[PDB]
Enzyme design. Structure first.
Site, PDB file in Angstrom:
ATOM      1  N   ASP A  44       0.826  -1.203   0.000  1.00 49.98           N
ATOM      2  CA  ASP A  44       0.000   0.000   0.000  1.00 49.98           C
ATOM      3  C   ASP A  44       0.861   1.255   0.000  1.00 49.98           C
ATOM      4  O   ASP A  44       1.663   1.479   0.927  1.00 49.98           O
ATOM      5  CB  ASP A  44      -0.946   0.043   1.197  1.00 49.98           C
ATOM      6  N   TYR A  49       3.263  10.150   0.524  1.00 48.72           N
ATOM      7  CA  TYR A  49       4.280   9.541   1.390  1.00 48.72           C
ATOM      8  C   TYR A  49       5.680   9.881   0.887  1.00 48.72           C
ATOM      9  O   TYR A  49       6.664   9.741   1.632  1.00 48.72           O
ATOM     10  CB  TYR A  49       4.149   8.010   1.513  1.00 48.72           C
ATOM     11  N   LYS A  78      -2.543   6.144  -4.207  1.00 48.06           N
ATOM     12  CA  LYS A  78      -3.604   7.072  -3.848  1.00 48.06           C
ATOM     13  C   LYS A  78      -3.387   8.469  -4.426  1.00 48.06           C
ATOM     14  O   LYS A  78      -2.269   8.998  -4.446  1.00 48.06           O
ATOM     15  CB  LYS A  78      -3.720   7.183  -2.319  1.00 48.06           C
ATOM     16  N   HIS A 111      -7.559   9.511  -1.924  1.00 46.04           N
ATOM     17  CA  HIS A 111      -6.959   9.402  -0.591  1.00 46.04           C
ATOM     18  C   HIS A 111      -7.901   9.962   0.482  1.00 46.04           C
ATOM     19  O   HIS A 111      -7.962   9.450   1.597  1.00 46.04           O
ATOM     20  CB  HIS A 111      -5.591  10.102  -0.577  1.00 46.04           C
TER      21      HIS A 111
END
Ligand SMILES: NC(=O)c1ccc[n+]([C@@H]2O[C@H](COP(=O)([O-])OP(=O)(O)OC[C@H]3O[C@@H](n4cnc5c(N)ncnc54)[C@H](OP(=O)(O)O)[C@@H]3O)[C@@H](O)[C@H]2O)c1
Ligand SMILES: O=C(O)COc1cc(Cl)ccc1C(=O)NCc1c(F)c(F)c(Br)c(F)c1F
Ligand SMILES: O=C(O)COc1cc(Cl)ccc1C(=O)NCc1c(F)c(F)c(Br)c(F)c1F
Length: 316
Positions: A44, A49, A78, A111
């Site tokens: 994931d 990130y 996402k 997201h």
């Protein structure tokens, strides 16, 4: 090693995946390599990130070395809500896909349902720290994401942090091409999501449980906050099986047919977290765990209720 949850597309989504939020560069590549070695097939990821380039490198290595085949991997990313304007959806996606060094994503998620001020400032906020909205909505984003499925760049779309109201808003959109295959939300014994899971399943939508260990390293954690890993009643159940608390917390979701994505960059723990297929929680144990619900969110710090489509104040 994982069993699977079948999606509405009939694709098979591995029921345990590797989380990557806050996995630092210099550690996330090794985390992914160890996970694939230990049997993980589901990773994931997300744009926000800012480590997809390192995840990509790890995935490529393991493919190069015959450790695994692309078709057996299940890679999720996402779309961040500063990119809800149609042209930005494509650009953001292209960056995610280039960083991951892949030709397609298995699932691409919204997201968060609320659109933020558009562009490459990922966290537009006022002086007080309140989110600044943008006019493009998650429906505008979904439109652009549906192109990616038409083109084969993404096999299925899904959502994250949606309540049933936002999912209804999506399912009921006239002219909808593709339906979401999953709703990724926080879920663990303090936030059991009974009604939301009931709703999603009834609409053919799987649930992916994030922060399943209660996200104990989250930067905003206060010592007074609940700690699932240190909960005596959880540890009681782990002891009964000669297992760890984390293993119980993970197994909990598997028995509800809910996909779960624990994060670690620690090799021993990455391995521990997928040794969850050699025991079973009893009905009585499942019932007890379910009773720990206190509608408590580890991820509830951000200030954005002033914008449309806030998901967390509805009952489910
Ligand atoms: N869609 C969303 O809005 C959203 C929000 C939050 C998270 N997520 C996804 O869900 C993933 C998991 O959630 P999360 O990262 O918030 O928290 P989490 O997986 O509940 O917990 C991660 C923390 O627990 C530690 N840990 C892992 N295994 C352990 C074990 N067996 N025993 C003790 N400690 C252990 C990890 O430490 P080490 O890493 O140092 O081993 C890390 O500090 C994220 O990484 C992200 O991929 C999505
Ligand atoms: O990003 C960091 O390194 C630390 O940031 C914080 C630390 C604390 Cl104690 C509280 C809030 C934040 C913060 O709002 N961060 C921006 C931020 C988010 F808003 C978000 F929703 C996602 Br998802 C992110 F990934 C992300 F980074
Ligand atoms: O997404 C991840 O994997 C990690 O999550 C985070 C990381 C940081 Cl540093 C700060 C906040 C979160 C987080 O709360 N995320 C879910 C989430 C959002 F994404 C968001 F935009 C709003 Br607004 C929210 F209210 C919210 F609940």
């Amino acid at each position: 090693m994982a069993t699977f949850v079948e999606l509405s597309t009939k694709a098979k989504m591995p029921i345990v995946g590797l989380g990557t939020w806050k996995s630092p560069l210099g550690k996330v590549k090794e985390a992914v390599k160890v996970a694939i070695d230990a049997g993980y097939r589901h990773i994931d990821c997300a744009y926000v990130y800012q480590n997809e380039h390192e995840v990509g490198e790890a995935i490529q290595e393991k493919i190069q070395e015959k450790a695994v085949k692309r078709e057996d991997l299940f890679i999720v990313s996402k779309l961040w809500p500063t990119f809800f304007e149609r042209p930005l959806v494509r650009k953001a996606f292209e960056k995610t896909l280039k960083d991951l060094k892949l030709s397609y994503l298995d699932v691409y998620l919204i997201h968060w349902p609320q659109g933020f001020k558009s562009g490459d400032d990922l966290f537009p906020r006022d002086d007080k720290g309140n989110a600044i909205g943008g006019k493009a909505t998650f429906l505008d984003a979904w439109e652009a994401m549906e192109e990616l499925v038409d083109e084969g760049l993404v096999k299925a779309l899904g959502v994250s942090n949606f309540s049933h109201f936002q999912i209804e808003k999506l399912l009921n959109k006239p002219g909808l091409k593709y339906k979401p295959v999953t709703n990724q939300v926080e879920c663990h014994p303090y936030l059991t999501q009974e009604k939301l899971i009931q709703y999603c399943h009834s609409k053919g939508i799987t649930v992916t449980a994030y922060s399943p260990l209660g996200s104990p390293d989250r930067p905003w954690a206060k010592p007074e906050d609940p700690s699932l890993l240190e909960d005596p009643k959880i540890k009681e159940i782990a002891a009964k099986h000669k297992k760890t608390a984390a293993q119980v917390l993970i197994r909990f979701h598997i028995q509800r047919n809910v996909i779960v994505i624990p994060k670690s960059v620690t090799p021993a723990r990455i391995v521990e977290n997928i040794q969850v297929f050699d025991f079973k929680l009893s009905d009585e144990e499942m019932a007890t765990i379910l009773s720990f619900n206190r509608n408590w969110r580890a991820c509830n710090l951000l200030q954005s209720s002033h914008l449309e489509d806030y998901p967390f104040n509805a009952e489910y």
